[PDB]
Amino acid sequence: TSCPVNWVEHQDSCYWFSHSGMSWAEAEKYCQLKNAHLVVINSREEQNFVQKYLGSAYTWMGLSDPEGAWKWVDGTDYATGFQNWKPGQPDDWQGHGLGGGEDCAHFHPDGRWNDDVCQRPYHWVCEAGL
């Protein structure tokens, strides 16, 4: 085993899928505590692997835009990288009325992405090197 117990190995990364929900900031903290990061989707092949094993619930990834531009937590370039947005997303929606727009990306159960309110308790995926 190249990955720790409770982690899944795929193509030179280890992944951990939560069975619980946290805000994006608390999930980011959790992953960093484990010497990992919220998942960064680098390719269609990795998107297919992650979406196949989602827990049938909205799930945070390591993609956010609170200071204006979309950034991956590990510095992977967003604009030249893989994208898989739901139709009409991202929309920085304000109409939830919770304050501000929407600055954190998550998967829908089908794998397509949405921007949502960072404070929402969603599932998350951690990713580390082998």
Nearest-angstrom CA–CA distance, 95 and 115: 13
Binder of residue 53, out of Cl ion, ligand A2G, Ca ion, none (CB less than 5 to 8 A by kind)? none
Convert residues 91-120 into a mask of x (bound to Cl ion by CB under 5 A) and - (unbound).
--xx--------x-------------xx-x
> Cβ 81 to Ca ion, closest distance in Å?
10
Of the candidate residues 4, 9, 11, 20, the single one contacting Cl ion (CB under 5 A): 20
Q: CB of 58 within 8 A of CB of 118? A: no
Q: Which helix (H) or strand (E) holds 44?
A: helix 44-52
Q: CB of 18 within 8 A of CB of 124? A: yes
Tell me: does residue 31 bind Ca ion (CB under 5 A).
yes
Binding site for Cl ion (CB under 5 A): 18-20, 83, 85, 93-94, 103, 117-118, 120
